[PDB]
Design a protein around this ligand. Structure first.
Ligand SMILES: *C/C=C(C)/C=C/C=C(C)/C=C/C1=C(C)CCCC1(C)C
Ligand SMILES: *C/C=C(C)/C=C/C=C(C)/C=C/C1=C(C)CCCC1(C)C
Ligand SMILES: *C/C=C(C)/C=C/C=C(C)/C=C/C1=C(C)CCCC1(C)C
Ligand SMILES: *C/C=C(C)/C=C/C=C(C)/C=C/C1=C(C)CCCC1(C)C
Ligand SMILES: *C/C=C(C)/C=C/C=C(C)/C=C/C1=C(C)CCCC1(C)C
Ligand SMILES: CCCCCCCCCCCCCCCCCCCC
Ligand SMILES: CCCCCCCCCCCCCCCCCCCC
Ligand SMILES: CCCCCCCCCCCCCCCCCCCC
Ligand SMILES: CCCCCCCCCCCCCCCCCCCC
Ligand SMILES: CCCCCCCCCCCCCCCCCCCC
Ligand SMILES: CCCCCCCCCCCCCCCCCCCC
Ligand SMILES: CCCCCCCCCCCCCCCCCCCC
Ligand SMILES: CCCCCCCCCCCCCCCCCCCC
Ligand SMILES: CCCCCCCCCCCCCCCCCCCC
Ligand SMILES: CCCCCCCCCCCCCCCCCCCC
Ligand SMILES: CCCCCCCCCCCCCCCCCCCC
Ligand SMILES: CCCCCCCCCCCCCCCCCCCC
Ligand SMILES: CCCCCCCCCCCCCCCCCCCC
Ligand SMILES: CCCCCCCCCCCCCCCCCCCC
Ligand SMILES: CCCCCCCCCCCCCCCCCCCC
Lengths: 282, 282, 282, 282, 282
């Protein structure tokens, strides 16, 4: 069974217009997200600076991917009638997403565990197992979706989606176990937010496999547009939504540390115009 | 009734020259606005850092859009006589504006509410209703103006302008209610400036729908030029004018907090060579 | 009377080489000027931070314009014999200058008034009158030089130069009145430097109208080269020379404020390896 | 004996896809690595700031090389059937690696010796011998692999690989001697990590010569793909793995200095959510 | 007597490969040098901040020039057989160097005088004479080498080299006199380093005129390659070697000032893992 790849469909001008929009909306939102990360980096204590580093990495790699894609889009389709017709650079409108996810899904795992209560070498061994399962999941997906079969083979897609799903269940179990172990050792206020943030990240991961099933089941400029919109939208919701959630946890944990004397922070911490902690001096 | 889209008009060299000017004037002004935002970010306390983050995002997304547009303009028209003739990349001189507004109008709502006296989860639920109504207004506009009909249909434009207008009235009501609730809980000096800043943002929003009515009613290189100039000018006035207004409120609220002992600020605050507050140490 | 526009002259290879040099020399010098602005931004107190912001804006807009121009130059002329022959993008070697001046001449006015002793219904009202007269002068010049007539009409150039000159006399009067009112309220040392800096900015503004009279009076690759060199040279002298002068005034005014207890500064201020003020703590 | 150069092989679309992936994965990972370096630069004391400077240089030069390569890849192969066929810009997909290594292998030597206990002019003379042996090793490799013979000659490759190997043994001896001399003068905790970091850097250097032996022994799109993947993977593991290891040593040495009174640090140092040292004031 | 210009010669693939390498090696090294400058800018006191500003300017202008050149190189030669054949953009592989030197040689003069013991107006008048003699030397060189005969005339080259040499002797005398006057007023340790740094800068200036004599005396792809390699190598040695030397002097002078109470520095100064001065508070 051969399917057409998502980049092998001619777009109606509406579709072509919608895909440029969402691609550029995403790059823009993630460049705002990068600026926000840099501007708010001093709200978090050095105990939790990994949260900022992961988030910065998520936003830079994603911005780059979406920039490349938007430029690839300009160069990858040619108007030949009422339709936009894909050329050889149209695969570059879809494939960079797997590059972005290959860095970013690992980095999201790291960000979540940044604000969890795992310490030392135990915190560095869960962190490796998660970065491995997460990269493997994306890379086995890229294999089905792009490499083996050319994205045109149903058996490839199903075998490499099924392998990717096993790495998903593994990463997810590793992460959920680590949050379940942390929540008792956190404060009630932090524990509630971390539980929510885990549900949000784990749920957002579900959306992505849906764009893979479309590629398996349906082809057309409709389905190419659907794919782009689903994935753009998910990237925005996850890489802007989840990354404020973890910043608020890191702020709150920093503040709790300031109140306990565990550390000092140079600025007051505000979360929603409520002061959490005062400025102090070394 | 079919209209020609704004990007489907040949430009006289005067028009072509005027459009490059205004497009480049806007990108330049917004890149200055970005530098100003970064340079003055320490004048505001951490309670009000969202104002800076929103403003930074407004300036980065807008600078990008205007850069893309200026380069699209170079590539989207070809001199064939005394006229510049639109090619397939001429829609890229008009469409990126809807991408910019899709981030920026939401971010302006956030910036205004940043310096208002709404706190906690109530401040995070007005903030979502406003970001929703604001994005929806732009996206329903992009649909009429670019996507459905190809920007060539009067019925599309009227239906999607009318939907966009409802989202406008909603966002505006949400925001005005929130400012009306805040002003009593602010100092007389801050309340006066926030009232002014609300009138300025709400009024500047009115200008934009006028460029949509032109596209409905009039076509030619005259009207394409008018559109570009109106929108460029509005972007400059709003994204440079309004964004100094909110920075002055945030400064003044920071200073009032410094005088009340609510927080400390590392530098003195000056507003117009009058000192508002002194430097202090944690 | 029709003249050839400056971008409508074929260049001898010497001229082509000289114009690339000066264009690239200017972009380079202004990128150094931008780095210097950022590196020295903490030498000035927050009372005088507008000086830094204006200067930063002058250097960013100018660097961009000169970059665009240098790339436009590479793509705007084609070697066809011993001569370089202008194409349709050769106007892009001359027109971006009016975009740069449109931001930068307003910003220079702001920078000069930054270190002057005005406030309230002038600090912000003289600043608007000056930004208006300054932008108007450039925009009326762009009209004669580029837009109306295509830069090929003597009557256009003379009418729009004459209008531009009235906006020049107005801006200049506004600025000179404001400096004359300030000098008595400054210290003898600051007053002397501000007088010098006013003479330098006002004098450098004179040079620019000379490139406009050349375009009126003379055409050839000689005169195109003369124009580029005069304007490049003026940009370097004014945007690097004047912008150190205002930084030294802001430093000295900061230091005087530190000695008077009007404010504190975190670092010592040195002007020419002579210490003006010591470091202090909030 | 003539071999085909690695850039002289037509790629199957799978191979073409795999090479874009790994090239873009590497550029992305190194741009994250650059952001991490900048964000964490204040965790290390000024005694050890060379570690940060070297690392920053490693990440910037590498990011540039991989960017250039990814763009060269887009422009250096053309789809002519089921195969991607190399042009004259395909050598630009392989040759920039030798530019990156020419800066980065010297910089890695400097980074390792940054956290070792060599001081003064003895520390500046081992540092030069290492930078020399390291640059020479890459440059003699570039000669065999690219310059002399065109990368198509076995005798060239073997003579210049053999010379490169001698510079490898020399650099390695210099570095290992310097670490062996340092470990007794370090704390047990730092000494253990530096021993590990030396083994990791020295071992990662071994991988690179394997891509050279492939070019000698095997040609095809298989072997071109193998080369890219091996080298991309090694770059990621070494330039992200090793550069966290040296940062942790610098942190720990900074902390030990803080506890001994040798210096003060403005922030607390955390290594794996365990506090090493407290914040202090001059 | 007509010579071929350096950009006229067809390159063998070895030469073409060697020139790309060295051009890219230089851009890379200077971009590392820029990052190092920014990272180490706080090691120097505000009395000596000009050293950092000059150095930053040297690294930015040079990085830009070398980037432009590397891209011009990709576009300025076309493979037509076993040879790479120059087009009209090949002069852009050689001419940007004169732009870089025009900023950078003036800036090097400023950097050397930054750490010398000249103060006030006397320091500002030697600084102008040096910036003039230095710019004039490069500009008179660009005239012989590029502009007057197209770089194809021996009489031009000899007359403009001879003029350039007089500006060299003048600048050098000005600078050496100023160092000779400073050394008695410096500490023995600083005086020794400044003497060395003067010899290093003055000696590195000698190398550059050798690439000019080659252009006069010899033409071929051999001699074009020689030119590029000599100049790249000199740029690396001078703009990375000399710029660490002046930073070490500025550090040491800062430290001496800290020990004398002349100023305070927020961080300890280390030079080669030996502490020069402690951190202090305003
Ligand atoms: C910000 C980016 C995120 C969180 C992307 C996540 C992507 C996934 C969780 C993808 C999962 C996949 C499967 C488990 C099925 C096969 C294909 C994949 C790679 C889309
Ligand atoms: C800085 C950008 C701003 C504030 C842009 C604002 C744009 C609008 C308020 C647009 C409104 C529209 C309507 C209500 C009618 C339909 C078309 C729109 C999208 C232009
Ligand atoms: C850094 C840029 C500067 C200070 C440029 C200044 C430009 C002017 C003062 C131009 C003046 C003009 C006239 C008064 C005559 C008509 C033409 C103009 C625009 C060149
Ligand atoms: C981050 C980059 C690294 C550490 C690259 C290292 C590269 C080498 C150690 C290469 C060694 C080579 C030989 C000794 C054999 C000849 C060819 C070389 C240059 C690949
Ligand atoms: C970092 C760049 C440096 C220090 C370049 C220096 C260049 C010179 C000292 C060039 C001198 C020349 C002469 C005196 C002879 C004529 C040609 C020149 C411009 C190469
Ligand atoms: C801190 C973590 C940041 C994200 C790192 C992402 C992981 C990168 C992994 C590199 C590649 C792994 C090796 C894959 C080799 C595949 C060979 C078979 C291809 C058919
Ligand atoms: C929500 C995902 C589906 C999007 C549908 C896109 C249809 C576009 C038709 C022009
Ligand atoms: C087309 C859909 C793209 C956006 C999906 C985002 C899903 C996030 C789910 C969040 C669940 C919250 C639970 C608490
Ligand atoms: C801090 C808040 C930042 C706000 C950024 C601006 C808003 C982000 C863009 C939201 C994207 C939503 C996408 C909706 C999908 C619609 C699909 C319809 C298909 C016809
Ligand atoms: C505000 C309205 C803008 C009017 C533009 C007129 C353009 C005339 C072109 C010669
Ligand atoms: C107090 C009232 C402030 C009113 C502000 C109105 C802003 C209008 C912007 C106009 C932009 C140019 C359109 C041609
Ligand atoms: C403090 C910030 C200073 C920024 C300086 C730049 C100001 C730009 C002002 C733009 C105003 C545009 C006016 C539009 C008029 C359109 C008329 C067209 C007639 C053909
Ligand atoms: C003062 C500027 C004069 C420039 C003269 C330009 C001559 C060029 C001749 C090739
Ligand atoms: C007393 C101050 C006098 C300063 C005069 C400034 C003149 C600047 C001219 C620079 C441009 C030259 C172009 C030829
Ligand atoms: C601070 C560490 C910097 C690391 C990068 C080191 C770069 C050194 C470059 C030196 C270049 C030497 C070239 C000599 C001439 C080569 C002759 C080639 C003949 C075929
Ligand atoms: C360890 C590297 C091995 C890479 C194998 C590449 C195979 C590509 C086939 C398609
Ligand atoms: C202590 C052992 C460290 C070994 C590092 C080796 C790096 C391998 C890179 C991937 C090559 C396939
Ligand atoms: C702080 C120093 C930075 C470097 C200064 C570089 C710029 C120096 C001035 C450039 C302009 C000189 C004017 C020369 C005009 C020549 C006209 C005749 C051409 C044939
Ligand atoms: C320092 C001289 C450099 C020599 C470069 C040319 C060598 C031959 C190229 C083949
Ligand atoms: C103290 C002596 C310093 C000598 C500096 C020489 C600089 C050489 C520049 C590189 C040579 C290229 C061949």
């Amino acid at each position: 069974d051969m399917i057409s790849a998502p980049w092998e469909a001619s777009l109606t001008q509406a579709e072509h217009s919608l895909i440029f929009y969402f691609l550029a909306l995403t790059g823009s939102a993630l460049l705002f997200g990068l600026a926000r990360t840099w501007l708010t980096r001093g709200e978090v204590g050095a105990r939790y600076r990994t949260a900022v580093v992961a988030r910065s990495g998520i936003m830079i790699v994603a911005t780059l991917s979406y920039v490349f894609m938007v430029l690839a889009f300009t160069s990858g389709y040619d108007h030949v009638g009422s339709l936009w017709v894909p050329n050889s650079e149209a695969i570059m409108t879809i494939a960079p997403r797997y590059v972005e996810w290959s860095i970013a899904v690992p980095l999201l795992s790291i960000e979540l565990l940044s604000v969890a209560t795992l310490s030392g070498v135990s915190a560095r061994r869960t962190r490796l197992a998660a970065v491995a399962g997460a990269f493997l999941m994306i890379f086995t997906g890229f294999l089905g979706a792009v490499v083996i079969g050319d994205g045109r083979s149903v058996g490839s897609l199903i075998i490499w989606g099924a392998i990717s799903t096993v790495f998903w269940i593994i990463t997810a179990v590793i992460l959920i176990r680590a949050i379940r172990h942390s929540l008792p050792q956190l404060t009630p206020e932090a524990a509630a937010l971390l539980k929510t943030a885990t549900i949000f990240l784990m749920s957002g991961w579900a959306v992505y496999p849906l764009a893979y099933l479309i590629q398996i089941l349906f082809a057309g400029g409709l389905w190419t547009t659907s794919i782009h919109i689903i994935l753009c939208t998910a990237d925005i919701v996850v890489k802007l939504g989840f990354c404020g959630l973890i910043h608020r946890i890191a702020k709150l944990r920093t503040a709790e540390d300031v109140r306990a004397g565990v550390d000092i922070h140079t600025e007051a911490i505000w979360i929603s115009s409520v002061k959490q902690s005062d400025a102090g001096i070394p």
